[PDB]
Amino acid sequence: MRPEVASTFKVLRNVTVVLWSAYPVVWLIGSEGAGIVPLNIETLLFMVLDVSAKVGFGLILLRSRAIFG
């Protein structure tokens, strides 16, 4: 190995970036029920989108088969 100036600089950046990305992950673990509120909001929004898309797809399919026959 070599404890170079370049070496130590790059090591510092690596550690800091890793810690940063890990920070929200660790939080979520230590706030499963606590910070559930925002999680619920997002899940609801996503589900609504899913439903509307599914309905649209159904309508398209009906139209297509009618035109074909």
Side-chain angles (χ1 to χ4, degrees), residues 42-66:
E42 179 61 283
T43 302
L44 185 287
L45 184 286
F46 188 11
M47 184 179 180
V48 174
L49 300 178
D50 302 344
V51 175
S52 71
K54 295 158 187 170
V55 175
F57 184 107
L59 299 175
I60 297 170
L61 182 60
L62 297 172
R63 295 153 56 200
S64 300
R65 60 76 171 282

Side-chain angles (χ1 to χ4, degrees), residues 8-23:
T8 185
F9 186 63
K10 281 69 186 63
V11 172
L12 189 167
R13 277 63 188 74
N14 169 71
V15 174
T16 55
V17 173
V18 172
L19 195 172
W20 174 65
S21 70
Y23 181 64

